[PDB]
């Protein structure tokens, strides 16, 4: 019910008139949603599927990456320089630098210029290998190469492969949706996601988003 | 006719001849031959953008009247709202007394934004669902012009005047969208309501115009 | 030899083939095979985007020289402008005496912002009309390369050097657009002019670089 003509659509029963002809159920995540007609061209639709999933993979890492140090500081008694994700980058400018987990023996980076231009070379080469191949194999598929990147062979079965593609893109869209939550939540409340959540569950009727509705993405206008 | 077909009005007047794409043929309402960014070269995308544009235009038409009415009512009709300016109207739900319609505490008198929010989700969620796939008030025969229960006075029964009404609708809407964009930037830049801006301007148009606030970037006084 | 056709230079160097869309074949200037978002898969849109890009590149090329000239002239040529920094240059029309060209009160000496604005509307309005459909300086034979009155020195008469000049034009223009993007973000972040940023940087590059302002979001010091 996630592929083919009898798949799930993005409006449930009210989908009978809101699914374009080119969204036929072939690709993962096809809920028949393209109201803006941005993927009518088959080549562009291929590009947007590549844009979407690559984003979804970064968001999946992002939600765990943003929540982990804040959850470790608030519930694991760990002492980071800055454990909140939107302030975490700034701990490179403090005295002592960026000590991993607060431990000065771990990483302990002192120069943002080294962090920056090391990432440029590594990610520059790594992304170059993604489009045209490199040390860890040939780029047989822009999203699912599954050579060195499927060591446990979880994509070997063609039938479960089709279902795993669905699980990947649905969890990824949830992660992207959450990362967008982090962004506006941080501008609006000024606090980290863990702290936002904790404050909310304590008094959900009083600790929700509408408390900050008088600000425009942080800015207190009017 | 001068709003359809090959001799219709174009978006550059006489300087148009060389700035009209081949796929803008004069078929749909509002076709002034303007798609310089080639965003509607695909016929299917063009179909979506016409639906986006008109659906926007209908919200803008309601918006301009919706934004101006309580402010015009307060400034010239002596009505006492909690917040009569559109961009401050939402905040009245957090004020004491809540959202009193027309200022009357016996009208609406809403106290909970959470109730306003999740009521609109259900009502608009179904209403938009009925728009794409039909529902209680008929079948969604056309994404923009169903005209069943939504043409009760049958003004679209004549094919010729129907074509002229479609033109009037999309032109008034683009004017409304263009005006709502005015509301947005005027509020960020001046901080006042549209009615007050209009009144202040005609008082001294040479001194009360936009360039007084050009040193601010959409409200922010940078540099 | 290496900027057109199948053996041209691409936007990822050796890692490029397999990251070049089928519709980027080497025919047009600047074709490094970069359209990862597939925004130009449609031939007609791709035609529009090439016009958007090049017209921007020409405005950016004029922009970089226009933004750097008064700031470099004021700080290194002993010239006294009213406001020599580009993002402050527009505001000098609101000061007393107005916009004196090069600071000399006998040059221009504009006093009305409304006069500058609505003269530009008429002049640029007609000029852009002449660009799409032709006019006094000839017919619009080509949307980007008319080369009638706009190639008086006939530098594009040789077909081979024309092909190379087209390449140089788009590469210098993309650098200018990329640089203008630098001006925009640099001014929001640092609050200083491009020349002064350059001068401050070369004095102590390890301490006078962008990361000093990384805690601000395009000017705003949030968090
Ligand atoms: C003959 C001259 C003629 C000209 C030049 C135009 C030109 C235009 N028309 Mg047409 N029309 C003309 C005749 C006619 N029009 C129409 C019917 C229409 C219609 C329905 C519409 C147009 C629209 C437009 C605009 C669309 C292009 C654009 O956005 O450029 C503008 C781009 C620019 C770069 C101009 C800006 C210059 C300005 C000085 C910038 C200001 C500087 C700021 C202060 C600095 C900013 C700072 C930063 C930080 C923000 C454009 C101004 C459309 C419109 O209104 O969209 C806006 C539209 O919807 N025209 C008819 C009836 C048949 C005509 C009769 O001859
Ligand atoms: C999402 C973007 C982002 C990406 C793709 C990376 C990617 C990387 N970082 Mg990271 N970083 C990123 C944001 C940030 N990093 C850091 C601080 C670091 C440090 C201290 C280190 C990395 C390192 C690395 C590498 C991982 C192990 C080698 C890899 C190239 C490591 C590295 O490059 O060592 C060679 C390493 O020591 N990053 C901060 C805080 C300033 C960030 C955001 O503000
Ligand atoms: C693409 C994913 C991503 C990225 C860019 C980052 C980025 C960062 N993490 Mg992080 N993290 C991530 C995923 C990610 N995380 C995930 C998925 C986990 C859980 C396994 C963690 C667990 C984690 C811890 C426990 C710590 C970081 C820390 C850091 C910072 C320094 C990292 C370092 O020294 O490298 C090496 C940096 C802001 C360190 C830091 O400064 O905390 C804020 C730190 O102590 N991260
Ligand atoms: C919910 C998370 C999730 C899920 C279900 C998948 C699912 C899949 N990924 Mg995937 N991926 C994810 C997150 C996820 N990914 C993230 C965050 C990244 C960025 C590091 C990637 C990077 C990635 C690459 C580079 C490759 C895959 C591949 C695959 C496929 C086979 C591997 C597999 O069964 O994964 C199992 C996943 C889990 C059991 C999740 C456990 C959570 C820890 C399958 C469709 C491979 C493929 O398609 O082979 C043909 C492949 O080459 N993914
Ligand atoms: C300039 C305004 C304007 C104009 C000219 C039109 C014109 C048209 N609309 Mg449209 N419409 C508008 C605004 C407008 N609409 C707005 C703001 C909305 C938002 C709800 C809609 C929603 C809408 C729907 C959902 C439908 C139409 C339909 C129609 C067509 C038949 C109705 C008609 O003749 O109305 C002429 C309009 C007026 C004379 C203006 C009336 C103004 C008063 C103040 C309204 C008072 C309301 C009580 C016609 C092309 C129907 C259609 O085409 O089906 C065949 C159809 O299904 N319109
Ligand atoms: C590095 C920048 C650059 C380059 C290489 C070109 C190159 C070209 N332009 Mg272009 N142009 C530029 C900037 C540039 N232009 C800018 C900034 C504008 C905005 C005014 C224009 C506006 C423009 C128009 C309107 C036309 C051209 C034309 C031409 C072509 C023939 C003229 C020529 O060789 O000029 C070479 C330029 C130089 C050698 C440098 C001069 C630099 C100083 C500052 C003057 C050629 C492909 C013509 C064409 O193709 O018609 C056949 C044409 O009609 N250009
Ligand atoms: C004729 C020959 C020339 C025609 C022509 O050129 O005009 C064509 C035409 C209209 C033409 C021209 C425009 C575009 C005026 C806009 C001027 C823009 C202004 C004043 C902007 C001010 C900006 C401010 C205040 C601040 C901005 C931002 C700044 C600083 C920064 C902030 O952070 C943001 C802020 C505040 C936002 C026709 O209507 C066309 C037509 C019609 C009707 C139908 C026909 O029958 C007859 C005819 C005549 C042709
Ligand atoms: C479908 C559709 C149909 C219509 O027809 C048209 C349409 C409506 C337009 C269209 C709809 C489309 C929609 C809904 C679009 C939505 C897009 C969204 C929300 C994208 C979100 C993506 C967000 C990402 C990648 C976040 C990555 C996080 C990282 C990096 O991995 C870090 O956190 C890294 C990190 C960590 C982990 C810790 C910190 O310390 C430091 C930093 C660097 C911040
Ligand atoms: C039916 C069904 C069956 C399946 O079997 C399972 C299923 C699929 C799950 C299920 C489907 C269910 C469906 C359709 C769910 C639909 C949910 C919707 C639309 C809910 C809408 C929520 C809207 C909200 C909270 C508004 C937030 C605004 C705030 C507060 O924070 C601002 O302050 C706004 C604001 C302001 C004022 C200023 C800005 O600066 C910042 C921001 C935050 C933007
Ligand atoms: C043509 C073209 C060709 C090229 O090739 C490419 C191109 C250049 C891109 C392209 C050009 C495209 C152009 C010009 C795009 C312009 C877009 C614009 C301005 C759209 C504006 C739309 C805005 C809307 C719907 C307003 C809604 C208002 C409401 C809702 O009713 C309320 O006020 C509701 C409301 C609220 C919520 C607050 C409360 O207090 C009460 C009230 C006031 C009623
Ligand atoms: C290989 C090769 C071969 C050919 O033969 C010749 C060749 C082609 C030349 C050559 C090609 C080379 C290649 C591939 C070059 C690659 C270069 C790259 C990727 C450069 C990386 C740069 C990254 C930087 C500095 C980050 C800057 C951001 C800052 C700090 O200044 C902020 O403040 C961040 C910031 C924040 C945090 C808050 C916001 O508000 C504002 C901003 C500014 C965004
Ligand atoms: Mg044109
Ligand atoms: Mg030609």
Q: How far apart are CA A117 and CA C116, in angstroms?
A: 46
Q: Enter the tokens of residue B88.
A: 């401050």
Cβ count within 10 A of residue B205: 10
Residues in A closer than 8 angstroms to C22, CB to CB, are: 43
Please list the alpha-helical segments (H only) found in chain B: 43-77, 86-89, 113-133, 159-190, 194-203
The backbone torsions φ and ψ at residue C121, rounded to the nearest 5 degrees and listed phi first, read -60, -50
Experimental method: X-ray
Q: Enter the tokens of residue B117.
A: 């929010």
Q: Enter the tokens of residue B204.
A: 């001294």
Are B81 and B70 within 8 A, CB to CB? yes
Q: Which atom of ligand 8 sits closest to the CA of residue A56?
A: 25
B163 Cβ partners below 8 Å, 6+ apart?
A: B1, B4, B29
C47 Cβ partners below 8 Å, 6+ apart?
A: B38
Strand partners, B99: B110
Long-range contacts of A22-25 (CB under 8 A, 24+ apart): A22/B44
DSSP 8-state secondary structure symbol assigned to residue A136:
T
Q: Which of B172, B144, B180 is nearest to B28 (CA)?
A: B144
CA dihedral C213, C210, A62, A143 (to 10 degrees): 160
Q: ∠ at Cα A151 (A149, A157), nearest 5°? A: 95
Distance from CA of A173 to the nearest CA of B (A): 21
Q: Which of C178, C180, C213 is nearest to C68 (CA)?
A: C180
| Nearest ligand by distance to the CA of B35 | 10
CA dihedral B57, B61, B64, B68 (to 10 degrees): -170
Q: Which of B181, B169, B184, B179 is nearest to B54 (CA)?
A: B169
The response to whether residue B12 sits with its C-beta less than 6 Å from ligand 1 reads yes
Are C116 and C127 within 8 A, CB to CB? no
DSSP 8-state secondary structure symbol assigned to residue B13:
G
Q: Which residue's alpha carbon is at the smallest distance from atom 2 of ligand 9?
A: A12
B49 Cβ partners below 8 Å, 6+ apart?
A: A36, A37, B39, B40
**A81: exposed, middle or buried (C-beta count within 10 Å: 0-12, 13-18, 19+)?**
buried
Breaks (C-N over 2.5 A) in chain C follow: none
Q: Enter the tokens of residue B94.
A: 């957090």
Distance from CA of A222 to the nearest CA of B (A): 7
Q: ∠ at Cα B83 (B78, B85), nearest 5°? A: 85
CATH superfamily assigned to domain A12-202? Chlorophyll a/b binding protein domain (1.10.3460.10)
Q: Do A213 and B48 touch (CB under 8 A)?
A: no
The backbone torsions φ and ψ at residue B217, rounded to the nearest 5 degrees and listed phi first, read -100, 100
Which is it for strands A107-109 and C99-100: parallel, antiparallel or unpaired? unpaired
Are B222 and C188 within 8 A, CB to CB? yes
Q: How far apart are CA C92 and CA C96, in angstroms?
A: 8
Question: How far from C84 is each of A3, B124, C182, C183, C184, CA to CA, in Å?
Answer: 62, 53, 18, 14, 16
The backbone torsions φ and ψ at residue C37, rounded to the nearest 5 degrees and listed phi first, read -85, 5
Resolution of the experimental structure, in angstroms: 2.6
Q: Which of A212, A178, A206 is nearest to A64 (CA)?
A: A178
Which is it for strands C108-110 and C99-100: parallel, antiparallel or unpaired? antiparallel
Using DSSP, state whether A67 is helix, strand or coil.
helix
Looking up tokens 């901080």 gives B191
The response to whether residue A210 sits with its C-beta less than 6 Å from ligand 9 reads yes
Are A48 and A34 within 8 A, CB to CB? no
Q: How far apart are CA A129 and CA A138, in angstroms?
A: 8
The response to whether residue B140 sits with its C-beta less than 6 Å from ligand 1 reads no
SS3 helix, strand, coil % of chain C, rounded to 5? 50, 5, 45
CATH number of this structure's domain B13-203: 1.10.3460.10
């Amino acid at each position: 019910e996630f592929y083919g003509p009898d798949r799930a659509l993005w409006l449930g029963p009210y989908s009978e008139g809101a699914v374009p002809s080119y969204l036929t159920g072939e690709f993962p995540g096809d809920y028949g949603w393209d109201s803006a007609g941005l993927s009518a061209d088959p080549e562009t639709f291929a590009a947007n599927r590549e844009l979407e999933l690559i984003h979804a993979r970064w968001a999946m890492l992002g939600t765990v990456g943003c929540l982990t140090p804040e959850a470790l500081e608030k519930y694991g008694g760990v002492e980071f320089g800055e454990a909140v994700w939107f302030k975490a980058g700034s701990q490179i400018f403090a005295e002592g630098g960026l000590d991993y987990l607060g431990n000065p023996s771990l990483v302990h980076a002192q120069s943002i210029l080294a962090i920056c231009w090391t990432q440029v070379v590594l990610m520059g080469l790594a992304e170059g290998y993604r489009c045209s191949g490199g040390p860890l194999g040939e780029a047989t598929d822009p999203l699912y190469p599954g050579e060195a990147f499927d060591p446990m062979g979880m994509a070997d079965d063609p039938e479960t492969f089709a279902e795993l593609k669905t699980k990947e893109i649905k969890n990824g869209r949830l992660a992207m949706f959450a990362m967008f939550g982090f962004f506006v939540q941080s501008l609006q409340t000024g606090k980290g996601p863990v702290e936002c959540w904790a404050e909310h569950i304590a008094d959900p009727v009083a600790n929700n988003g509408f408390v900050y509705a008088t600000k425009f993405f942080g800015a207190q206008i009017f």
